[PDB]
Amino acid sequence: NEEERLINDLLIVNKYNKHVRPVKHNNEVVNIALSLTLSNLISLKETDETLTSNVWMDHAWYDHRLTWNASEYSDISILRLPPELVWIPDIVLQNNNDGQYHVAYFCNVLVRPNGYVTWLPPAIFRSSCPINVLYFPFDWQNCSLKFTALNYDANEITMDLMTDTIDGKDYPIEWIIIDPEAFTENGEWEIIHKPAKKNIYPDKFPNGTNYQDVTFYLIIRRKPLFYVINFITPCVLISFLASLAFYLPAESGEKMSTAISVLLAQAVFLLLTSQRLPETALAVPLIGKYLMFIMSLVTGVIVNCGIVLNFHFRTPSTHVLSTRVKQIFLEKLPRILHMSHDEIKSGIDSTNYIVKQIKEKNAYDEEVGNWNLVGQTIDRLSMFIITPVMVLGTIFIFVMGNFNHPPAKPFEGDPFDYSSDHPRC
Amino acid sequence: ENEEGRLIEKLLGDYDKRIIPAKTLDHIIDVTLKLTLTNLISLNEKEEALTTNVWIEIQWNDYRLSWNTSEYEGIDLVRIPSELLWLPDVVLENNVDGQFEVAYYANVLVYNDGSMYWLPPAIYRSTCPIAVTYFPFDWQNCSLVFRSQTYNAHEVNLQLSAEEGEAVEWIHIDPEDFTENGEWTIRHRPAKKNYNWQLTKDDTDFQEIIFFLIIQRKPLFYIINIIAPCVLISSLVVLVYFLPAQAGGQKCTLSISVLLAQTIFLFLIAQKVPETSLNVPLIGKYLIFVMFVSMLIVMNCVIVLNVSLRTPNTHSLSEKIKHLFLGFLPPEIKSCVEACNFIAKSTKEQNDSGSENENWVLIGKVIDKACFWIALLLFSIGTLAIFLTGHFNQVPEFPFPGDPRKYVP
Amino acid sequence: SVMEDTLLSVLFETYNPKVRPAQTVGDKVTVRVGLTLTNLLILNEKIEEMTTNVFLNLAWTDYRLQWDPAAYEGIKDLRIPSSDVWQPDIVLMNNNDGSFEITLHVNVLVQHTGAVSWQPSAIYRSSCTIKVMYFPFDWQNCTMVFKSYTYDTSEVTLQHALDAKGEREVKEIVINKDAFTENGQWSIEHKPSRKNWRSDDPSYEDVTFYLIIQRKPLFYIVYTIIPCILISILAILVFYLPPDAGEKMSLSISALLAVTVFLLLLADKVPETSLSVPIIIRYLMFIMILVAFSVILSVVVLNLHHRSPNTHTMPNWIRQIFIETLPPFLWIQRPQDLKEAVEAIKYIAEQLESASEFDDLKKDWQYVAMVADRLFLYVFFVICSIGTFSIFLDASHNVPPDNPFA
Amino acid sequence: SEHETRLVANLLENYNKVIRPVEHHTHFVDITVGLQLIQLISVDEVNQIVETNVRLRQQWIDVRLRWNPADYGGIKKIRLPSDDVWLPDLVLYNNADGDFAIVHMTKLLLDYTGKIMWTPPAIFKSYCEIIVTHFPFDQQNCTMKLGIWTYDGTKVSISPESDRPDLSTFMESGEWVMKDYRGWKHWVYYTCCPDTPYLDITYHFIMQRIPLYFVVNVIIPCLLFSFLTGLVFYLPTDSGEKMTLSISVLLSLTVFLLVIVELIPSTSSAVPLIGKYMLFTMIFVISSIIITVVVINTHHRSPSTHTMPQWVRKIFIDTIPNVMFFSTMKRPDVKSAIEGVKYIAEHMKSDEESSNAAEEWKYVAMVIDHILLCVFMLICIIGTVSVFAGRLIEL
Amino acid sequence: SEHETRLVANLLENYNKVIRPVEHHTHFVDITVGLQLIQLISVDEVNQIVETNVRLRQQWIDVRLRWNPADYGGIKKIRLPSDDVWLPDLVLYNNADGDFAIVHMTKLLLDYTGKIMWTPPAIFKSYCEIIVTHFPFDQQNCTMKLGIWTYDGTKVSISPESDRPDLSTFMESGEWVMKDYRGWKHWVYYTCCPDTPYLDITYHFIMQRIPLYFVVNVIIPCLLFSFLTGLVFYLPTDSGEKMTLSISVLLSLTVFLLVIVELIPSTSSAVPLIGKYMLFTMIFVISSIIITVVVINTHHRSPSTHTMPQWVRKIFIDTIPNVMFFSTMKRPDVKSAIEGVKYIAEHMKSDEESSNAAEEWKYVAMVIDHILLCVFMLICIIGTVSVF
Ligand SMILES: *[C@@H]1O[C@H](CO)[C@@H](O)[C@H](O)[C@H]1NC(C)=O
Ligand SMILES: CCCCCCCCC
């Protein structure tokens, strides 16, 4: 096997030092071209603001020390060498959470006879991308993987985006590479844009490790079907049940029970919403806004049902039915709302007394009925005022949420699409 | 000048730890196992894992590490770090996680005749499939399976330890060192060498040593804090049969409320047993039974309420029903006169309607009184039967039903 | 390059990384320690642990790593793997887990004058005690204590770091605007640094970085406080309902259970220490007790309303207080056949008169109940408003001091 | 054994573990790969991750490790640390969040002919495309893709040991049933150049869930709530408990939302079967509450304000009741005194008229209740069957 | 330092870290062991594990590492990697969930006389027998048993540095208070042979829980609902709401029982007092519900089918009401027309009789309610003295 002789010549005879940059003179720069491939998007658990991703990092550089004349040895056109024997550019994900800066598996490097070295290790990265909950559950996130070279400064190694060729002209790969055949779309998120950028920070100095950067951005959109089915429509229907509290007659002593139950169910949905979100305070989530609005509205409904009940049970012995109230609630509003021989002397005196008592009782009863009608009128007015407010608020909030598409172009100030189908030039 | 230094330098110099110490081609190394349980840490039902604190005593013989005592001032025992020696890769196979090897790699005691004694401690998490059928009155049968990860029966011969010729066929528990777990009691603790006859002696899984832990749950806590409350709450359903069947009686309120309380207890029991789909826990069966009974009582309350609030307007009281349910189971003068007659007639009509309503109410009361006895009998019998079958879930008398041996020191 | 190999071979021929660099026996190594905060990940209050992502700016001088650039093609500095040189065992002392050392071992930079600089990265889980008295309207003061685990003041001298163009010491945590993610739940008000000694022990010295962080309570405001205010409104309202509606107990008990459940579903978030009771829990307890008293007085009002002369006799003091004195203050002012026929009529009339007297007494009882209900309504409106306003005003006036005191 | 010590010393003296075991660099190393599933640890439907415990049997031939037994006391096999020889870097291509390659560097068996056998254990966490359409009566098909990471088909070629994995020592899941399993080898080429294949082996397992835990913990309570919901229409309106019962059912179902949400998968690819059933139950309860409110409103209609329309009387009082077979429902001062008696009589006439009208309204309400009772029991049964039996028959 | 470089080169040239540091195999190594508690990380009651952050100071003598300062420029102390010299294998016997031995191999200080001081850190997760019988007012006594694993007392001897572990830099807990702490050395012998002692050192800390958190968050609501329990006997039966109140109290108490049971370990060694009192309160509420259902049944008793027994009338209308002092209880066709009027009068008479019977039953029910309310207040005033 000639490979043994060749590797012995390259690493032992030539005294290869894996702790020295591959440069002939110590003022040049090593160009490491790096690209990223997304094997699959695991999760974006929003509570801890973590993006867990399975990626393959493609590094490519030149090492003049690992060059050989293919004819002098047998026609060996490629070598596989473990990364613990050769110099490797330690490129680290700076914005991680769990303290895993490096690739997971250190595979072999492929070395060509001209010195070109390519290294494609896989990695599992748990990066930090803050969550914007303004439009949850109709939100889209903008997460980032920021790779830096902390072992050398920009004057010693220059990171770059990997290039590719189609028809003899080379163009940079400015996107995360996704293999359409192997990639399986995530259960909850859909990828919209995936740019890749090399960032310079001019206010820093090239003789430092915080001057360069390569950032891969994932713009993703939540598929809002789980939450529409399990959170939004049950809550909306149970909230609409509040309006029915006004169509329920006050004789059936069950208005307050209905309204209070609606409020309690809404509190349950509030609990769930709280449980499913991070503690940030940048903004109140859309579903949070809706829950606040509907809970305040249902509290108003409960208060108004209480007022209606208080009116319904008034009697002439405790309250006075003024003429103003009669005019307002029995003439105007119902029209506006389209609402639909001493023994015989003793006998005579006793029967007269009976008649007087019955007449008084009848007057009492008819005034009670008038109070009941006033209560019904207040019920109808409240229903008309409140139901449309509830319906319009719900519709407005949720259409505003449903109209929250991603901006159709990353980097607003940039007219480039960063799409794998239209490389620059 | 420590002579142990030169002795150990002589021993380890020219010693390869990758070579099994076989004197000849057909020699088989006798590897002897013993287990000392010091603390039964836990038995997690949700992940089906028993966590124990053990010392595993492994003994073998390495003919290379032998010397002559008189040559080293009577030294007859040395301690050598186990990373420098050949070890039989004895591992716990039924481990939930990937942790095969021991926790702390302690030194090995080497005696001048070659005897190697290794007593590493370990925190072992082993798979213990649970039988929830009689929860919480159940007993569990957990197993620690040890076998060599590298050598087959043609190279290493696993065996149980023996002191004074008697084989140690049990997990060793020192009364002074051991601490009882409170939630469990160790009833049986046998050990035995097992063979997988479906394989051959060249498969590394042919032989194994299995230590068994049969543990009985102490239920007093579970009783006092789950069952008595649940039974007491569920017994309230029968009370709906004494509330009046009219507005303000609140039959449905009480019935539905007891049903919801039973649901809460069901949930509490949910997060205490494995998510396996083989059997339903005993307490779960009891909760299902009481929930079904309370649903039936809700239905019966609805029916009684419907019967009691009937009127001549809607339903006609058949004579057959009435008999069955109340005999077996239990110028100006003319105007004034006309007005008086009309008043009397109307009052009598109203009173007759009221009497019919009263008869319907009585029928409702009789139905209520009968269903009370039916429901009380059903509930009491069900509760007593379920918890009596729970209380008679005794642990087997012998560790292995076939054998007559007790397997104790 | 070849010259880099030659220089490395010359430098590390007899260099022993286990030996602290001291030109002369008794010399001390001056170590400059600074911190750069890249991200303030978490401030878990359940385990009193702050997670941070940081760089440690460490600098010292090692006289052994000296060379003359003119002899090596003008190499001014080298990047040498960090495990090849001596480094001070600078560790975070007050960590919560067992991780003392850094996580990422980036290679050091050595200059021809012997100045070694090292900027390792780390995900540190420090432990800071939480002051739970104004949670969630609280500000925390979490410290990170760095010092050499092995060497003491007789071996190394800790100093602050220098700024970008080293001219003056930097006495703060450095924040790089290009690489720094705002937490979203905490805002950093002060970030000083300071060297600390101990009087009893003269061999101790450390550099501590303090983070004064103020919480943004919007999440808690919404998700706990707003429902509680609504529940308190319902509790007050219970006293406007008429006793005949038969729904006072439903409303009051529902409010009580709702607020109790809100208290229960907050132990998952509030810290578990016992040196004080957080303001949110105090507010919840206040509302819970208020609603319980609302239940009690609703029961009392119903009991008053459902009395009758067959059962009770109104004593003088209740009449004096509730029928006379209170109402004006509360604006709640208010032949044998004919002989048989005549006897029947007289009996009917007497029965009606007796019923009328009975009903008048019953109505007096009901009026007493109404007046008591109105009085309780006003009293609890006042109490709830005053208590809520006082508690939240006290919470509002809780800000970190303008002087960090460190 | 001194013989084995000398043998192992001689084998590894001039051995370089970073070179492929081939006589000539143009040849390739044939590796036989087999998978032994020992346990199916778990499946995570939300994240689509299948966690399995396996052994990864690998066999190949290393020409550099031959020896003649006669020269070493007849030794024919030895065990060597896998770290001491060349190993194929088999990688799980579709790893989800576990280790990509083998990390438990156990020992391997070596024959005197160079044949190497290596069976390391592994915990594979694979990406599993989960389909929740028929949950919990769902069948999941997902795979383990294996291949040599850094070598192409002209350098290291891998072939399956058998036509399907080995489940001889496979523990019983208790939550899944192994319906089927197989393994296939794929060649792959690229537009570059067709003389360089890239091989891999995909082992797929088809599993069927045991739907007992989910049934007894989710479906039964849903059925009980559905039954109690329709139970409200037999309760008379006079007993002030219609809304109490129905609303209690609604709140209990809302609380059950917590349990169901924490249990069922939280994906958005498709609506689970039990998701459809629960949404149906929620709509059922809400519709019952709305109709009950309407019925209650009708029962208390007063003749003073509302007059019964003719069509209502014709339908609910004359037509429908006749065709309801199941129910048993029916189908000086003397002048003042005289004037007062007349007034009492006329007032009683008016009260009788009003009472009769109100009674008619109550009768209409009761008839509506009966109709709705029948309709709602029918709808409950039909909806349950339509949701479940459609899938259950295919099983 | 050139001098220190040469010193370290000479010290480790012919040094074997596998051999005990004694000048004769018969002697023993005397190791001084001290435990310094830096922080009490946690006390997991359900799992019964105490996680503490500690430093394990160990001092001994290694005559193989001595040197003469005059020959090395006057160096009198150095720092060496602990991995380079022989270290005692000190192990925590009662480890439960952590690492048995020291895993943070920090540097150690070495004098010119051979005196080695090594103070590595550790997180000890030791088993703690939690006695939940006075929870949340309980005090815990759980320990840390340290001992040399593979060497007996005749080869390696350990002695405590001081009577008590060092808590000079202890970080105050906020959940527990250290009442006492002490360390004891134990010799152990075996029937083998009485000339081979086995030594260990057991440190123990007595921790007193601070109960404010559990009181405020658990006990106060439970007491509140227990107090509300007896209030149901003041609610009149006509309101038609007694069952609502009673059942709400029952549900609240059972929820709090759920919390309690998931707050404490499942051990059956002793019955927690909190659990016992919660069970008693649950029995109390159940009795409340049963007796109030009896009251409700009495109140609506129909006079037609039930007639008041004499004993009930006497007891509940003749004697008890006088005992309650502070209460406010009480203690042609003209013939047809005439016949109709007489019928109306007779019907009113019968209705009055039936009513009077009904109000007698209602009065009995009200008296029973007052009796039960007085009993409840008596139990309350007895309970409030128990805490004192
Ligand atoms: C051991 O050593 C002694 C004295 O050194 C010697 O007499 C004896 O032969 C040796 N061998 C045995 C087996 O004792
Ligand atoms: C002769 C007059 C009789 C009046 C009867 C009034 C009945 C009211 C209940």
Residue numbers in the entry:
A (entry chain B): 2 to 341, 416 to 500
B (entry chain E): 1 to 330, 411 to 489
C (entry chain C): 1 to 334, 398 to 469
D (entry chain A): 1 to 331, 370 to 433
E (entry chain D): 1 to 331, 370 to 426
Give sentences from the paper.
Nicotinic acetylcholine receptors on muscle fibers are inhibited by many general anesthetics and are the principal targets of neuromuscular blockers used in surgery. The receptor assembles as a pentamer from four homologous subunits arranged α-γ–α–δ–β pseudo-symmetrically around the channel axis. The large extracellular domain (ECD) harbors the classical neurotransmitter binding sites at α–γ and α–δ interfaces. The transmembrane domain (TMD) of four α-helices per subunit forms a pore lined by the M2 helices.
Further focused classification revealed two distinct states of the receptor, one with rocuronium bound in the pore and one without. However, the density for rocuronium is remarkably clear, revealing only one possible orientation and set of interactions. The M4 of the αγ subunit detaches from the receptor in a manner similar to that in the carbachol-bound desensitized state, wherein only M4 of the αδ subunit is detached. The tightest constriction in the pore is at the 2ʹ residue T244, a position also associated with the desensitized state constriction. Thus, despite the extracellular domain adopting an antagonist-bound conformation, the transmembrane domain appears to be locked in a conformation reminiscent of agonist-bound desensitized states. Could pore block contribute meaningfully to the paralytic action of rocuronium? This site is likely too low in affinity to be relevant in a clinical setting, however the structure shows how a representative blocker binds and thereby stabilizes a unique receptor conformation where the ECD is in a resting-like state, while the TMD resembles a desensitized-like state.
